[PDB]
Curated annotation (Swiss-Prot), chains A, B:
<keyword id="KW-0560">Oxidoreductase</keyword>
<dbReference type="GO" id="GO:0048038">
    <property type="term" value="F:quinone binding"/>
</dbReference>
<keyword id="KW-0801">TPQ</keyword>
<feature type="binding site">
    <location>
        <position position="423"/>
    </location>
    <ligand>
        <name>Cu cation</name>
    </ligand>
</feature>
<comment type="subunit">
    <text>Homodimer.</text>
</comment>
<dbReference type="GO" id="GO:0008131">
    <property type="term" value="F:primary methylamine oxidase activity"/>
</dbReference>
<comment type="function">
    <text>Catalyzes the oxidative deamination of phenylethylamine to phenylacetaldehyde with the concomitant production of hydrogen peroxide and ammonia.</text>
</comment>
<dbReference type="Pfam" id="PF21994">
    <property type="entry name" value="AGAO-like_N2"/>
</dbReference>
<keyword id="KW-1015">Disulfide bond</keyword>
<dbReference type="InterPro" id="IPR015798">
    <property type="entry name" value="Cu_amine_oxidase_C"/>
</dbReference>
<dbReference type="InterPro" id="IPR054157">
    <property type="entry name" value="AGAO-like_N2"/>
</dbReference>
<comment type="similarity">
    <text>Belongs to the copper/topaquinone oxidase family.</text>
</comment>
<feature type="binding site">
    <location>
        <begin position="371"/>
        <end position="376"/>
    </location>
    <ligand>
        <name>substrate</name>
    </ligand>
</feature>
<dbReference type="GO" id="GO:0009308">
    <property type="term" value="P:amine metabolic process"/>
</dbReference>
<dbReference type="InterPro" id="IPR049948">
    <property type="entry name" value="Cu_Am_ox_TPQ-bd"/>
</dbReference>
<feature type="binding site">
    <location>
        <begin position="288"/>
        <end position="299"/>
    </location>
    <ligand>
        <name>substrate</name>
    </ligand>
</feature>
<feature type="binding site">
    <location>
        <position position="584"/>
    </location>
    <ligand>
        <name>Cu cation</name>
    </ligand>
</feature>
Length: 620, 620
């Protein structure tokens, strides 16, 4: 009966039937996005109304539609025709992944470029790459994908080892036409294979690893009710899943004695972009919004027990829609388990003689997705002491190129003749805050150094300063690692026992933000990525930092347009948007399959509790 | 037979006998430090010579001595009398911990200050605090401790809850005299107790935590030979222990095929300081060099199975000397175990159809020490993929004060009337590098942003720049998080298969460094803490960033004097010194016992290997 329950197969089937009965889902239509809408503010009526939002693509070239359906009442609430030249194209369809290669295989320009390189067309894979917005006027309002080619020597061969540099093609996937084929010159196709399961490359497998057995003989300490409601060590939350964002956390709260205290209303990774820093015209257009353009939830992996998730695992199997509105289950797509996390608190006292040790643990909610060459793990952690942490784990195969004769300032060499262009992976966490309720504010906290002098005669004093962000126009902030800058989200109307406002402190990793020139296309389309922290006033329709339709959108949508409203955020219903990313200069050790690298952020209580919240943890 | 073996009880007994026979260890002498010296460069003679370095204190006021003994040959190698007004006092003795309180209890000034506050002297604990060097000319050349008072309501009471503010005393612990008693005014003694095992404060203990069982049914994957030589998943190293530094790692190397490749010759935490930022004259002198003044190894805890270390644990029990030269074993003082560490590498390929997942794990070497109110865990981690990481875990009880009427800019309030002064915990890691041998150099790597224009027409390009540090005078470096600054240690004479020098990249956390005014006493005594990275040319006697005798040393010793030699470090035997720290603004949640907070650094391979070094890891 919870409004935050996962979508069920029956709900998706009903959406299909409603759209069919309304005349919106004929044979030429494809569902590009389908997801459940969150309850509006003030759902204290408890009148169940499950609403779904659908993006409908038309393969015959008619305008696509955005539709909102009530599955409870069996009605279409609104349907609007989209002008994609204005507001953006729809996300990439899975069925379009193979279209780029198929169309190019019969194009005489493509075939002539392959013949010059003595490449058999049957062996050439073409990646279906989002196009962005650049100088090609004919692409405005057309659904375009670009293609880069990789050779597969045999069906199980890793094509990433064999990039075909100097060659790129653009395709209109609706009219089924190749618009441009660009050949800037012949580069040798790197010949070494990258087959990480080939014994010739791995050598004999290690025999030295002894098993690590992790079991819970009495079962786990958390409970799951209503399909997706979790209770664990005073935490309470709902685990949602959306085909665009992936795992979404709702209603994160902490049971402090008798009171269930809210902390975060909704937490998600609302966008992620991979900009490339190679100025070659073959690749200088590459910026993949893995979330906004491709939808990371739909490519979530089925996670295997003992391999992907180790220990006493509870799985969720979310249901999504296929392109025709049929339900599709992602079996074992979400892993949930608790983990030991070392020492929580420890002291041996020289005067009382008491020796005290307690252990920590964390609840893990995770999924893993695969977008072409990239594989990303998304991990949310809840700790006994009130800390919330997010971690992204980046792995997969690096996107490759040729390595030019005489080297490169923008590409790493991985193997003879094989390069990997510099790039970033930049995430946006959208944190709809609810610190003890919805009346919240954000303060920026810097360390303050003090000069030796009167009142500081020994030159040892240091302090801190807090600046309240009062309006959206002043709430676009940069990191400053040297001054220890953090941000505090507090509730000015809820005080702890010392009469101080309760709060949580956001600790960033202070990694570089978007490196591209501020006048570039990507700086305008991924404006969120140029600053570490944004604060907006909550609004139902302000969901993504890049806007609703990211694919081939010209720029400025999302956060820069939201904050122009200059709304009051001092003790209001607010949303924190945190940018954080990895800057990847590929190393030889990343090849032929990359070991995990990580980035994230965490939030820690800051006078939220009246004392340590883990005094009642028993001594193991 | 290894020269890097742990000291044994018999070796310490022999040092005692050698010193006794030489006339250096009569009844008035105390051993303040005793440790084994590392083999000199060029120990390829394999002529065993175990040498020990001893600091000898004299309780009758005679000059202390530094002595070097050969335990193999039964001889004194050198003995020098120390002028402590010039070169510094010896470290604090454990037997001096109780002397400050005992001396003050019969001083009429102290007793009058306690009587004004209606405090029973039998209930007043006095902390034995290092003195530093300030304006008191009478302290030059005298062995001084300072005392701050805390009330214990009963023997098992936590005295930290009841600081006696406004009062400080200075004591000469050799002549047994109170030099000064300073009373700046009466502050209420905070009355709330801080007894974290009292059921009245904890409430009922949780019954919701189910056990997590971690076992290795075939035993661990590492082997221990010769007492302290570890081999694990291609890593090879020796685990040392020193009473000042604690756990020391020697001869860290990696078996790459047929070749044992060195990476780090010696790794240690060579100093750690806790400067306080409260300008009150009661506390403005407080800077505790927990390593250099107190010796963190001698207060290492005995670690309890299932509580401090969980899983299949192998213990080392290091032996140290007491003040009379008798061996004392720290039972179960070092924990060693391997841990699962999530996903190592993962990819599901859209064209080959291959799905691949491998798990990571890490080897953990850890100890925990207690210095008064503080408890610190020191963790070294080795990962399958070649990563080396250090982590400090800070816990214990915060050092307290009164919280003044009308608040404070330099103190946090924790409970009614109870404050916690701002402070930092700053560590120095000394990394004697040996990347593929001893010919190493350090490069500083910054991200380079590029302007949109010719050759970068779309404004997307970004690059990197590396600057070689060629001499010691240019090798004092600051962090720059915004430009992604890292440091690479490479071997210019050892190239990977792409003809690039092999290297390792140091990733810092980029936390603030020392905040005190640069003209302060602590900035001169802890000069290492003002900069993130130092590189020196190796020298046998340059062991600590603060010098050999830190206690009451006037300043400038250690790193600033070493780098003045301006030695060649471009392809030489070099040592990297990395400063990293926590800046602690105490929160209510830190009281009455603090949950762990962490800081550290890591080193990752950077073209050290010819490809990923974990291709031979089996599929679980
Ligand atoms: Cu990458
Ligand atoms: Cu602290
Ligand atoms: Na537009
Ligand atoms: Na909010
Ligand atoms: Na001096
Ligand atoms: Na060295």
């Amino acid at each position: 009966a919870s409004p935050f329950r996962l979508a069920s197969a029956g709900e998706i089937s009903e959406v299909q039937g409603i759209l069919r009965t309304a005349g919106l889902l004929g044979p030429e239509k494809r569902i590009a996005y389908l997801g459940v809408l969150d309850p509006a503010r003030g759902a204290g009526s408890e009148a169940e109304d499950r609403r779904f939002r659908v993006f409908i693509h038309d393969v015959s070239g008619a305008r696509p539609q955005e539709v909102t359906v009530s599955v409870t009442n069996g009605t279409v609430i609104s349907a609007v025709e989209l002008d994609t030249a204005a507001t953006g194209e729809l996300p990439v369809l899975e069925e379009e992944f193979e279209v780029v290669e198929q169309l190019l295989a019969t194009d005489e320009r493509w075939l002539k470029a392959l013949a010059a390189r003595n490449l058999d067309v049957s062996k050439v894979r073409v990646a279906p790459l989002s196009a962005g917005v650049f100088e090609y006027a004919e692409e405005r309002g057309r659904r375009i994908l670009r293609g880069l080619a990789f050779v597969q020597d045999f069906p199980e061969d890793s094509a990433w080892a064999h990039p075909v540099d100097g060659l790129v093609a653009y395709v209109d996937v609706v009219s089924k036409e190749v618009t441009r084929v660009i050949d800037t010159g012949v580069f040798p196709v790197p010949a070494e294979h990258g087959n990480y399961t080939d014994p010739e490359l791995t050598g004999p497998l290690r025999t030295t690893q002894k098993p690590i057995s992790i079991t819970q003989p009495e079962g786990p300490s958390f409970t799951v009710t209503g399909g997706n409601h979790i209770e664990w060590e005073k935490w309470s939350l709902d685990v949602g899943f959306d085909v665009r964002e992936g795992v979404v956390l709702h209603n994160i709260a902490f049971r402090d004695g008798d009171r269930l205290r809210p902390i975060i209303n909704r937490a998600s990774i609302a966008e992620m972009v991979v900009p490339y820093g190679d100025p070659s015209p073959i690749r200088s257009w590459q910026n993949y919004f893995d979330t906004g353009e491709y939808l990371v939830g739909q490519y979530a992996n089925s996670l295997e027990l003992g391999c992907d998730c180790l220990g006493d695992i509870t799985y969720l199997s979310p249901v999504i829609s296929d392109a025709f509105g049929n339900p599709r289950e992602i079996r074992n797509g979400i892993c949930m388990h608790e983990e030991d996390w070392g020492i929580l608190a420890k002291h041996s006292d020289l005067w009382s003689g008491i020796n005290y040790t307690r252990r920590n643990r964390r609840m893990v909610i995770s999924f893993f997705t695969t977008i072409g060459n990239y594989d990303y793990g998304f991990y949310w952690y809840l700790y006994l002491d009130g800390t919330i942490e997010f971690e992204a784990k980046a792995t997969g195969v690096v996107f490759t190129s040729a390595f030019p004769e005489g080297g490169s300032d923008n590409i790493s060499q991985l193997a003879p003749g094989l390069g990997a262009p510099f790039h970033q992976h930049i995430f946006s966490a959208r944190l709809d805050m609810a610190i003890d309720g919805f009346t919240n504010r954000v303060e920026e906290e810097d360390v303050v150094r003090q000069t030796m002098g009167p009142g500081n005669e020994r030159g040892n004093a240091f302090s801190r300063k807090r600046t309240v962000l009062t309006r959206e126009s002043e709430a676009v902030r940069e990191a400053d690692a040297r001054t220890g800058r953090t941000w505090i989200i507090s509730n000015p109307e809820s005080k702890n026992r010392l009469n101080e406002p309760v709060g949580y402190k956001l600790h960033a990793h202070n990694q570089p933000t978007l490196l591209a020139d501020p006048g570039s296309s990507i700086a305008r389309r991924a404006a969120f990525a140029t600053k570490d922290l944004w604060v907006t006033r909550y609004a139902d329709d302000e969901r993504y930092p890049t806007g609703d339709f990211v694919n081939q959108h010209s720029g400025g949508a999302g956060l820069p347009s939201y904050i122009a409203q200059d709304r009051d955020i001092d003790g209001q219903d607010i949303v924190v948007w945190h940018t954080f990313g990895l800057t990847h200069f590929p190393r030889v050790e990343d090849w032929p399959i990359m070991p995990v690298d990580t980035v994230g952020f965490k939030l820690r209580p800051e006078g939220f509790f009246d004392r340590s919240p883990v005094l009642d943890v028993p001594a193991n």
